[PDB]
Amino acid sequence: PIVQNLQGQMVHQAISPRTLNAWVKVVEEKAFSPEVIPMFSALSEGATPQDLNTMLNTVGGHQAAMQMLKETINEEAAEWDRLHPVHAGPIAPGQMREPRGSDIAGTTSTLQEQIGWMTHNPPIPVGEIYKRWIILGLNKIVRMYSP
Amino acid sequence: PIVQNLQGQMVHQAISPRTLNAWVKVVEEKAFSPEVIPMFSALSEGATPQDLNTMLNTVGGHQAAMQMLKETINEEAAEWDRLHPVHAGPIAPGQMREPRGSDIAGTTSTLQEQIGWMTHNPPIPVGEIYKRWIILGLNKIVRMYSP
Amino acid sequence: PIVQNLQGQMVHQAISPRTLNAWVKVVEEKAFSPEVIPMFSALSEGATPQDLNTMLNTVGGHQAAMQMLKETINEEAAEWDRLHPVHAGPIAPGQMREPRGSDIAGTTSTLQEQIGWMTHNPPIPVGEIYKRWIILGLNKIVRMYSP
Amino acid sequence: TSILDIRQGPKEPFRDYVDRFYKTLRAEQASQEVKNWMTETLLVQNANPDCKTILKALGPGATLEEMMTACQGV
Amino acid sequence: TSILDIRQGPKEPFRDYVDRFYKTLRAEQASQEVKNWMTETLLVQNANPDCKTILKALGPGATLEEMMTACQGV
Amino acid sequence: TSILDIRQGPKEPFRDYVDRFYKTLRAEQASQEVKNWMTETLLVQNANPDCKTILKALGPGATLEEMMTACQGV
């Protein structure tokens, strides 16, 4: 995640193993139950896309759901690209590039790039955009997996 | 929560996973027992409304009680709005807006807004107002759930 | 508790959950056994009255003993008020008020007030006065609960 | 399981049923107004005859602690 | 369970009963004066005949360690 | 349980008894001089005849390792 250091700057720090394991354990115990979404939300505080793929990729089991989510993440990403067209002409030397759906999904962007966008002024909340897609896709799952 | 930093200012820091899990475990083990209220009170030290909805939303089970509480929180909030009318004329540029029942419940306010009210001089104790509603609603539950 | 910060001042910091739980677990396991008193004493290092009521209020079970203790705490408090009369005339603007039995028991005092008395120069050891009452009342219990 | 399929047993305490209701209601995502409509309507309707009878005597305006204490012996 | 429903068994130690009493008293929220009234009154009243007899001999003014040591063999 | 009620069984090792003694002595709060008096007196007095006999042969001035090794076969 990207956290504030004592000095008063935003720097990246790694997520903790008993945080990781707590994510694992939630999924083990409460599967598709709604409490998973606030839980997720708390444990995703200050998290990167990269950390969010890590969390999704580290799941075991419920592979039908994991595939449905993936496909929701790509749909929501396809929709990001649709709604926000690429911008006019070449990229400025003085500036950094606008993200695509796949940069938001973490796929086409690097960590330093993910830190550029979030730490820069104005900052862009690429975590929160992926977060809604995850929560939206979580609703899809919850609604389906209701019996 | 909003905690004091080493530098001597009040800044927000996130609540810890084994704090979260300790909240979960209390509820698992002691359900509606009275010891839950001091316990709550200690673990709610320096907590935001936002953190208090997080704690309530992360409950599993006892959904009749969770609904009774919600409805108590809204009643107590409706009562906040009744007792404290909105103030005269437009909001000053130099000042920040007075809270409503729903800002106290965390619903209509943002975190930075919740930090403005608490950190500002005079400070307003919107945590402690929600806390009484929670404790009051906890009494309702305890009294009902006595057998 | 009130602890010394790195800067070299005495500031309040909250007590830890696995400290709380260790207090709980001691009581669960060793009930009225004498080892409870040194144990208490260590875990009460630098503690406030407020934290001491928190610890007493968070007990479950042994309610006959908990009531006997309460009643000992009030007796010892009644005795504090008896032995130390209130002082002559009005309270000075330049000074802060002398405690009563109920301020020592934490009841009539606020935290900032509890920090004023302890951090101020000379400091007054209102923790250690309550601590003796707790230990004295612990002797009463231990002696009774011997079989 | 659908919210319409939530019903109270003939021997099941109301309490255990109300818990089931706000759990399933917890997995419904509808507007609050619709969920209010579901609350006053469906809960009583799928409640058992013995408690149903009881709840009819509370009249309207009733709140959950009073419903929950009202159907306790049933 | 209501505070009036708290009573001492015919074979139940007083001690186990007094624990039950201040647990239920712990769930009563009444003024202190009323709770004092409950203490001196209801505790002895629902105490068993053998201990009840014992407690009558302590007279008034008695405190909990003396009541608790008084009904120990019973 | 009172300190006077602490006694050694007819088959109980002294050792297990001495442990019981300083545990109960650990719950006595009396002056040190009185507790010294209890040590030299009550311990031997409630000790069993076979070990009691043994301890009488150690004479006075004896210390706990020597008492504890003295009554080991008993």
XYZ file of C-alpha atoms in Angstrom:
663
model
C 0.000 0.000 0.000
C 0.917 3.694 -0.128
C 1.027 5.119 3.321
C 2.173 8.359 4.892
C 5.658 8.286 6.482
C 6.675 10.085 9.630
C 8.629 12.768 7.533
C 5.161 13.751 6.023
C 5.331 12.191 2.589
C 3.402 9.417 0.906
C 5.664 6.293 0.413
C 4.928 2.691 -0.551
C 5.177 -0.022 2.220
C 4.424 -3.676 1.761
C 1.279 -5.355 3.146
C 1.683 -7.497 6.264
C 1.587 -11.436 6.334
C -1.042 -11.533 9.168
C -3.001 -8.972 7.054
C -2.622 -11.370 4.074
C -3.639 -14.333 6.190
C -6.580 -12.375 7.661
C -7.751 -11.849 4.038
C -7.353 -15.542 3.430
C -9.180 -16.553 6.604
C -12.199 -14.237 5.906
C -12.662 -15.950 2.544
C -12.244 -19.356 4.066
C -14.805 -18.733 6.759
C -17.503 -16.453 5.339
C -17.169 -17.373 1.547
C -19.735 -15.146 -0.357
C -21.418 -13.631 2.858
C -22.077 -9.759 2.722
C -19.729 -9.040 5.600
C -16.984 -9.837 3.256
C -17.513 -6.385 1.493
C -16.942 -3.953 4.508
C -14.203 -6.361 5.569
C -12.536 -6.097 2.150
C -13.000 -2.339 2.211
C -11.172 -1.932 5.562
C -8.303 -4.272 4.533
C -8.102 -2.374 1.191
C -7.442 0.954 2.825
C -4.585 2.682 1.004
C -4.107 -0.339 -1.262
C -2.698 -0.391 -4.861
C -4.094 -2.199 -7.940
C -1.109 -4.352 -7.750
C -2.058 -5.287 -4.162
C -5.674 -5.827 -5.190
C -4.538 -8.351 -7.996
C -2.378 -10.022 -5.342
C -5.417 -10.460 -3.049
C -7.594 -11.836 -6.006
C -4.839 -14.074 -7.340
C -4.087 -15.551 -3.922
C -7.685 -16.953 -3.630
C -8.163 -20.759 -3.589
C -11.430 -22.332 -4.387
C -14.754 -20.707 -5.667
C -13.362 -20.589 -9.207
C -16.632 -20.071 -10.878
C -17.044 -16.865 -8.881
C -13.412 -15.900 -9.433
C -13.907 -16.213 -13.154
C -17.242 -14.184 -12.978
C -15.375 -11.465 -11.133
C -12.517 -11.380 -13.641
C -14.911 -11.018 -16.472
C -16.749 -8.171 -14.514
C -13.362 -6.487 -13.877
C -12.608 -6.598 -17.709
C -16.164 -5.412 -18.493
C -15.883 -2.500 -16.110
C -12.340 -1.823 -17.502
C -13.726 -1.969 -21.199
C -16.317 0.515 -20.023
C -13.542 2.751 -18.566
C -11.867 2.901 -21.921
C -15.115 3.542 -23.738
C -16.232 6.456 -21.449
C -12.858 8.042 -21.248
C -11.297 8.304 -24.728
C -7.483 8.791 -25.138
C -6.489 12.484 -25.165
C -5.398 14.853 -27.969
C -1.989 14.503 -29.569
C 1.391 13.271 -28.029
C 2.125 12.947 -24.339
C 3.910 16.104 -22.838
C 7.522 15.695 -21.460
C 6.455 17.659 -18.406
C 3.528 15.304 -17.693
C 2.665 11.748 -17.117
C 0.234 9.718 -19.178
C -3.499 9.270 -18.512
C -4.510 5.704 -17.300
C -6.541 3.178 -19.258
C -8.877 0.336 -17.878
C -5.894 -2.017 -17.830
C -3.711 0.530 -15.883
C -6.582 0.667 -13.332
C -6.656 -3.084 -13.278
C -2.938 -2.813 -12.652
C -2.071 -4.912 -15.674
C -0.380 -2.311 -17.971
C 0.958 -0.148 -15.240
C 4.030 -0.553 -13.078
C 4.144 0.214 -9.319
C 6.107 3.348 -9.725
C 3.525 4.399 -12.258
C 0.697 3.534 -9.761
C 2.548 5.638 -7.089
C 2.995 8.556 -9.707
C -0.747 8.901 -10.293
C -1.867 8.601 -6.624
C 0.972 10.764 -5.073
C 1.066 13.394 -7.751
C -0.940 16.698 -7.520
C -3.944 16.404 -8.461
C -4.007 12.761 -7.513
C -6.186 10.259 -9.388
C -8.021 7.510 -7.374
C -7.433 4.452 -9.490
C -7.810 2.271 -6.264
C -11.268 3.671 -5.694
C -12.282 3.033 -9.350
C -11.103 -0.582 -9.154
C -12.726 -0.795 -5.666
C -16.190 0.068 -7.070
C -15.711 -2.607 -9.826
C -14.803 -5.104 -7.095
C -17.733 -4.056 -4.944
C -20.093 -4.093 -8.007
C -18.819 -7.514 -8.985
C -19.202 -8.522 -5.314
C -22.909 -7.551 -5.511
C -23.243 -9.739 -8.664
C -21.772 -12.648 -6.816
C -23.707 -12.120 -3.548
C -27.003 -11.894 -5.581
C -26.238 -15.023 -7.529
C -24.949 -16.972 -4.588
C -28.024 -16.242 -2.538
C -30.029 -19.561 -2.513
C -9.415 6.688 14.482
C -7.983 10.163 15.097
C -4.953 9.946 17.270
C -2.226 12.311 18.382
C 1.060 12.087 16.430
C 4.513 12.468 17.884
C 4.833 16.057 16.325
C 1.855 17.061 18.650
C -1.027 17.195 16.214
C -4.191 15.170 15.834
C -4.012 12.955 12.643
C -6.129 10.064 11.378
C -4.616 6.486 11.542
C -6.378 3.329 10.522
C -7.692 0.758 13.034
C -5.672 -2.435 13.466
C -6.716 -5.975 12.088
C -6.213 -7.691 15.517
C -8.311 -4.797 16.959
C -10.947 -5.574 14.271
C -10.757 -9.279 15.001
C -10.925 -8.626 18.771
C -14.213 -6.761 18.074
C -15.401 -9.715 16.066
C -14.397 -12.267 18.695
C -16.142 -10.365 21.573
C -19.395 -10.497 19.611
C -18.898 -14.118 18.762
C -18.267 -15.124 22.338
C -20.370 -12.889 24.594
C -23.253 -12.008 22.095
C -25.651 -9.594 23.988
C -23.863 -9.899 27.476
C -23.342 -6.504 29.385
C -19.571 -6.759 29.259
C -19.873 -6.033 25.645
C -20.607 -2.284 26.482
C -17.358 -1.347 28.460
C -15.535 -3.531 25.942
C -17.018 -1.559 23.035
C -16.262 1.682 24.846
C -12.536 0.863 25.245
C -12.182 -0.330 21.611
C -14.067 2.835 20.502
C -11.562 5.181 22.057
C -10.740 7.939 19.572
C -12.941 6.312 16.929
C -14.800 8.045 14.015
C -18.432 7.565 12.887
C -17.048 6.025 9.840
C -15.178 3.491 12.018
C -18.287 2.911 14.122
C -20.367 2.061 10.884
C -17.506 -0.249 9.893
C -17.745 -2.094 13.242
C -21.646 -2.360 12.946
C -21.564 -3.352 9.285
C -18.934 -6.033 9.848
C -21.267 -7.946 12.271
C -22.531 -11.419 11.230
C -25.526 -12.964 12.785
C -28.075 -11.469 15.354
C -29.852 -9.614 12.546
C -32.954 -8.925 14.460
C -30.862 -7.008 16.988
C -28.816 -5.360 14.241
C -31.992 -4.096 12.654
C -33.349 -2.877 16.110
C -30.116 -0.982 16.598
C -30.238 0.618 13.149
C -33.720 1.805 13.740
C -32.616 3.204 17.227
C -29.641 4.935 15.537
C -32.085 6.617 12.997
C -34.520 7.471 15.825
C -31.794 9.063 17.895
C -30.511 10.807 14.690
C -34.160 12.071 13.873
C -34.195 13.374 17.418
C -30.831 15.146 16.822
C -32.292 16.992 13.899
C -35.457 17.858 15.769
C -33.649 19.281 18.881
C -31.035 21.113 16.948
C -32.627 23.095 14.092
C -30.492 24.284 11.097
C -28.936 27.725 11.700
C -29.752 31.212 10.346
C -28.975 32.111 6.754
C -26.094 30.861 4.421
C -22.965 29.081 5.567
C -19.926 31.501 6.113
C -16.807 31.087 3.829
C -14.649 31.343 6.928
C -16.510 28.499 8.677
C -17.538 24.961 8.296
C -21.095 23.686 8.400
C -22.977 22.432 11.474
C -23.621 18.588 11.521
C -26.988 16.888 11.178
C -28.120 13.411 12.617
C -26.894 11.753 9.425
C -23.438 13.499 9.653
C -23.232 12.076 13.219
C -24.225 8.711 11.888
C -21.428 9.244 9.402
C -23.720 8.825 6.425
C -23.730 12.390 4.940
C -20.303 13.324 6.074
C -16.921 12.491 4.605
C -13.833 11.554 6.681
C -12.120 14.811 6.131
C -15.310 16.455 7.277
C -15.383 14.172 10.402
C -11.698 15.162 11.085
C -12.623 18.955 10.532
C -15.241 18.949 13.287
C -13.250 16.921 15.883
C -9.794 18.597 15.254
C -11.052 22.110 14.838
C -11.226 24.640 17.766
C -13.833 24.331 19.527
C -14.120 20.677 18.678
C -17.507 18.939 18.496
C -17.834 15.345 19.895
C -19.871 13.638 17.227
C -18.255 10.243 18.308
C -19.556 10.716 21.819
C -23.080 11.583 20.544
C -23.174 8.467 18.359
C -21.597 6.516 21.285
C -24.524 7.368 23.612
C -27.004 6.263 20.856
C -25.065 2.996 20.568
C -24.954 2.549 24.321
C -28.694 3.491 24.620
C -29.555 1.071 21.846
C -27.300 -1.477 23.598
C -29.442 -1.091 26.759
C -32.583 -1.714 24.620
C -31.072 -4.877 23.298
C -29.658 -6.122 26.637
C -33.123 -5.537 28.280
C -34.943 -7.354 25.528
C -32.468 -10.167 25.256
C -32.605 -10.874 28.953
C -34.679 -14.136 29.279
C -2.188 4.829 30.827
C 0.130 7.837 31.106
C 3.483 7.020 29.682
C 6.613 8.947 28.808
C 6.997 9.896 25.116
C 10.232 9.964 23.190
C 10.288 13.889 23.316
C 10.593 13.513 27.194
C 7.101 14.382 28.339
C 4.368 12.409 30.042
C 1.417 11.785 27.590
C -1.625 9.508 27.727
C -1.656 6.369 25.436
C -4.382 3.784 25.325
C -4.002 0.275 26.804
C -3.422 -2.583 24.363
C -6.112 -5.292 23.373
C -3.725 -8.238 24.124
C -3.020 -6.453 27.465
C -6.825 -6.272 27.993
C -7.242 -9.898 27.008
C -4.299 -10.925 29.233
C -6.207 -9.277 32.134
C -9.284 -11.201 31.133
C -7.455 -14.515 30.811
C -5.746 -14.196 34.266
C -9.173 -13.801 35.863
C -10.582 -16.653 33.868
C -7.802 -19.012 34.821
C -6.676 -18.163 38.359
C -9.998 -16.599 39.713
C -9.268 -15.460 43.366
C -5.672 -17.040 43.572
C -2.935 -14.741 45.201
C -0.894 -14.545 42.023
C -3.590 -12.389 40.699
C -2.293 -9.439 42.915
C 1.377 -9.115 41.593
C -0.093 -9.834 38.165
C -2.584 -6.973 38.544
C 0.173 -4.748 39.888
C 2.419 -5.287 36.824
C -0.470 -4.785 34.341
C -1.487 -1.651 36.327
C 1.840 0.049 35.845
C 1.249 3.666 34.837
C -2.516 3.105 34.765
C -5.303 5.718 35.365
C -8.424 5.405 37.566
C -10.364 5.445 34.435
C -8.361 2.426 33.201
C -8.763 0.707 36.563
C -12.676 1.110 36.344
C -12.424 -0.269 32.804
C -10.570 -3.373 34.071
C -13.157 -3.873 36.974
C -16.165 -3.205 34.764
C -14.982 -5.599 32.062
C -15.075 -8.579 34.528
C -17.617 -11.390 33.904
C -18.645 -13.733 36.589
C -17.763 -13.730 40.405
C -20.385 -11.045 41.032
C -20.555 -11.541 44.705
C -16.859 -10.680 44.902
C -17.256 -7.831 42.419
C -19.947 -6.333 44.588
C -17.776 -6.834 47.797
C -14.959 -5.016 46.053
C -17.172 -2.126 44.948
C -18.417 -1.652 48.429
C -14.729 -1.763 49.732
C -13.757 0.807 47.052
C -16.619 3.157 48.295
C -15.658 2.485 51.942
C -12.032 3.311 51.295
C -13.192 6.366 49.228
C -15.582 7.492 52.164
C -12.543 7.158 54.383
C -10.503 9.338 51.952
C -13.031 12.095 52.264
C -13.220 11.769 56.022
C -9.393 11.911 56.582
C -8.787 14.637 54.103
C -11.301 17.473 54.601
C -11.968 20.026 51.772
C -9.596 23.020 51.936
C -10.080 26.655 53.042
C -12.077 29.064 50.917
C -12.519 29.211 47.030
C -10.338 27.432 44.511
C -7.436 29.679 43.121
C -7.456 30.581 39.340
C -3.776 29.711 39.233
C -4.371 26.226 40.684
C -6.296 23.101 40.178
C -8.672 21.558 42.677
C -7.818 18.940 45.321
C -9.282 15.395 44.620
C -12.011 13.677 46.607
C -12.600 9.826 47.113
C -14.778 9.808 43.999
C -12.069 11.624 41.895
C -9.670 8.851 43.050
C -12.238 6.289 42.097
C -12.323 8.098 38.779
C -16.039 8.755 39.005
C -16.129 12.593 39.422
C -12.989 13.291 37.533
C -12.363 13.500 33.814
C -9.256 12.081 32.061
C -7.719 15.416 31.462
C -8.241 16.095 35.129
C -6.587 12.709 36.008
C -3.623 13.670 33.707
C -3.477 17.231 35.400
C -2.929 15.801 38.879
C -0.393 13.069 37.915
C 1.646 15.185 35.365
C 1.620 18.400 37.302
C 4.469 19.421 39.721
C 4.182 18.138 42.598
C 2.305 15.179 41.222
C -0.322 13.357 43.296
C -0.506 9.498 43.097
C -4.216 8.890 42.850
C -3.440 5.534 40.995
C -1.411 4.345 43.944
C -4.187 5.318 46.424
C -6.802 3.429 44.402
C -4.235 0.588 43.962
C -3.943 0.080 47.753
C -7.802 0.010 48.017
C -7.837 -2.619 45.256
C -5.063 -4.602 46.895
C -6.755 -4.250 50.356
C -10.064 -5.336 48.883
C -8.160 -8.152 47.120
C -6.914 -9.356 50.545
C -10.554 -9.321 51.804
C -11.590 -11.458 48.907
C -8.601 -13.854 49.033
C -9.219 -14.366 52.828
C -12.895 -15.015 52.332
C -12.471 -17.187 49.296
C -9.962 -19.407 51.022
C -11.886 -22.684 51.799
C -32.879 -18.439 -1.654
C -35.420 -15.703 -2.488
C -36.988 -13.304 0.175
C -40.528 -14.656 -0.670
C -39.278 -18.115 0.284
C -38.515 -16.904 3.875
C -41.369 -18.176 6.152
C -41.881 -19.034 9.837
C -42.193 -22.648 10.893
C -45.146 -23.966 12.849
C -42.818 -24.580 15.951
C -40.066 -22.044 15.017
C -39.661 -19.045 17.295
C -40.401 -15.742 15.596
C -37.104 -14.497 16.825
C -35.236 -17.122 14.779
C -37.353 -16.123 11.773
C -36.769 -12.409 12.159
C -33.029 -13.086 12.132
C -33.456 -15.022 8.889
C -35.484 -12.148 7.455
C -32.977 -9.347 8.017
C -30.136 -11.658 6.833
C -31.948 -12.223 3.487
C -33.085 -8.512 3.510
C -29.308 -7.854 4.114
C -28.752 -9.605 0.565
C -31.449 -7.554 -1.082
C -30.077 -4.402 -2.699
C -33.569 -2.526 -3.441
C -34.475 1.135 -2.629
C -35.106 1.808 1.114
C -38.842 2.612 0.507
C -39.264 -0.826 -1.094
C -37.371 -2.474 1.692
C -39.728 -0.589 4.202
C -42.667 -2.024 2.253
C -41.131 -5.498 2.582
C -40.646 -5.034 6.294
C -44.205 -4.121 7.166
C -45.686 -6.561 4.725
C -43.845 -9.774 4.115
C -42.611 -10.382 7.688
C -46.135 -10.609 9.114
C -47.615 -12.404 6.141
C -45.177 -15.328 6.388
C -45.338 -15.390 10.146
C -47.108 -18.555 11.655
C -50.947 -18.446 12.516
C -50.342 -18.386 16.314
C -47.988 -15.384 16.181
C -49.746 -13.893 13.247
C -52.833 -13.693 15.422
C -50.656 -11.975 18.165
C -49.200 -9.440 15.711
C -52.580 -8.522 14.349
C -53.450 -7.403 18.030
C -50.381 -5.100 18.225
C -51.977 -2.912 15.440
C -49.874 -0.677 13.187
C -47.128 1.648 14.408
C -45.446 -1.255 16.239
C -41.607 -1.536 16.630
C -39.292 -4.536 16.661
C -38.666 -4.885 20.449
C -42.463 -4.836 21.005
C -43.042 -7.413 18.202
C -40.205 -9.534 19.471
C -41.443 -9.456 23.098
C -45.023 -9.874 21.827
C -44.494 -13.271 20.164
C -42.131 -14.755 22.821
C -44.399 -17.422 24.354
C -45.576 -18.697 21.001
C -35.429 -13.338 33.238
C -36.877 -10.842 35.748
C -35.200 -9.979 39.175
C -38.335 -11.287 41.056
C -37.771 -14.643 39.371
C -34.295 -14.950 41.035
C -34.652 -17.394 44.008
C -32.421 -19.761 46.008
C -32.766 -23.499 45.551
C -33.437 -25.864 48.418
C -29.857 -27.417 47.974
C -28.224 -24.402 46.207
C -25.480 -22.596 48.093
C -26.337 -19.005 48.942
C -23.090 -17.985 47.413
C -24.180 -19.270 43.987
C -27.458 -17.384 44.450
C -25.838 -14.125 45.472
C -23.767 -14.259 42.287
C -26.970 -14.711 40.288
C -28.520 -11.775 42.134
C -25.842 -9.175 41.422
C -25.616 -10.412 37.784
C -29.374 -9.756 37.293
C -29.072 -6.561 39.477
C -26.155 -5.753 37.051
C -28.943 -5.788 34.186
C -31.273 -3.588 36.163
C -30.828 0.094 35.340
C -33.009 1.658 38.350
C -31.989 4.507 40.743
C -29.385 3.480 43.393
C -31.894 3.996 46.294
C -34.257 1.511 44.617
C -31.452 -0.898 43.992
C -30.500 -0.534 47.783
C -34.123 -1.381 48.594
C -33.857 -4.457 46.361
C -30.654 -5.523 48.048
C -31.920 -5.504 51.605
C -35.290 -6.870 50.674
C -35.474 -9.285 47.804
C -32.205 -11.165 48.462
C -33.332 -12.399 51.884
C -36.932 -12.962 50.899
C -36.035 -15.400 48.101
C -33.328 -17.036 50.141
C -34.101 -20.734 51.214
C -35.754 -21.469 54.710
C -32.521 -22.919 56.205
C -30.405 -19.867 55.324
C -33.282 -17.522 55.711
C -33.469 -18.627 59.323
C -29.639 -17.949 59.614
C -29.932 -14.464 58.085
C -32.763 -13.490 60.356
C -30.233 -14.120 63.317
C -27.622 -11.744 61.800
C -30.106 -8.813 62.378
C -29.932 -5.602 60.342
C -26.742 -3.676 59.613
C -25.109 -6.844 58.234
C -22.563 -6.784 55.321
C -21.923 -9.213 52.481
C -18.792 -11.023 53.818
C -20.663 -11.680 57.104
C -23.797 -12.910 55.228
C -21.681 -14.997 52.919
C -19.687 -16.587 55.784
C -22.923 -16.878 57.799
C -24.743 -19.183 55.356
C -21.706 -21.330 54.352
C -22.628 -24.654 56.003
C -26.197 -24.556 54.765
C -9.778 -23.863 54.217
C -8.047 -22.883 57.484
C -4.260 -23.533 58.222
C -5.218 -25.782 61.238
C -7.160 -27.965 58.811
C -3.926 -28.724 56.830
C -2.754 -32.264 57.846
C -0.688 -35.099 56.342
C -2.412 -38.245 55.143
C -1.483 -41.692 56.378
C -0.114 -42.599 52.810
C 0.549 -38.999 51.601
C 4.165 -38.031 51.011
C 5.392 -35.284 53.311
C 6.584 -33.440 50.292
C 3.023 -33.124 48.955
C 1.957 -31.904 52.402
C 4.716 -29.342 52.731
C 3.619 -27.870 49.403
C 0.071 -27.615 50.746
C 1.395 -25.953 53.894
C 3.331 -23.115 52.270
C 0.433 -22.561 49.799
C -2.008 -22.042 52.724
C 0.774 -20.162 54.673
C 1.042 -18.126 51.381
C -2.751 -17.080 52.082
C -2.040 -16.192 55.674
C -1.203 -12.512 56.111
C 0.150 -12.642 59.907
C 3.411 -11.105 61.283
C 6.600 -13.015 60.264
C 7.341 -14.056 63.916
C 3.900 -15.691 64.089
C 4.393 -17.337 60.759
C 7.844 -18.650 62.093
C 5.958 -20.046 65.092
C 3.526 -21.756 62.709
C 6.367 -23.217 60.705
C 8.188 -24.901 63.551
C 5.023 -25.952 65.277
C 2.064 -26.824 63.139
C 3.941 -28.540 60.281
C 5.354 -31.267 62.535
C 2.263 -31.600 64.680
C 0.008 -32.437 61.719
C 2.624 -34.607 60.098
C 1.764 -38.440 60.043
C 3.067 -40.792 62.916
C 5.668 -42.509 60.662
C 7.281 -39.236 59.543
C 6.549 -37.544 62.789
C 8.711 -40.168 64.443
C 11.473 -39.404 61.796
C 11.283 -35.638 62.384
C 11.514 -36.011 66.117
C 15.010 -37.710 65.449
C 16.251 -34.717 63.385
C 16.081 -32.558 66.613
C 15.721 -28.771 66.482
C 17.744 -26.485 64.221
C 16.736 -28.557 61.172
C 16.190 -26.995 57.674
C 13.750 -27.829 54.896
C 16.057 -29.804 52.521
C 17.100 -32.011 55.482
C 13.437 -32.499 56.577
C 12.389 -33.157 53.023
C 15.184 -35.707 52.411
C 14.585 -37.122 55.909
C 10.972 -38.210 55.319
C 11.415 -39.438 51.693
C 11.004 -43.206 52.182
C 7.959 -42.836 54.386
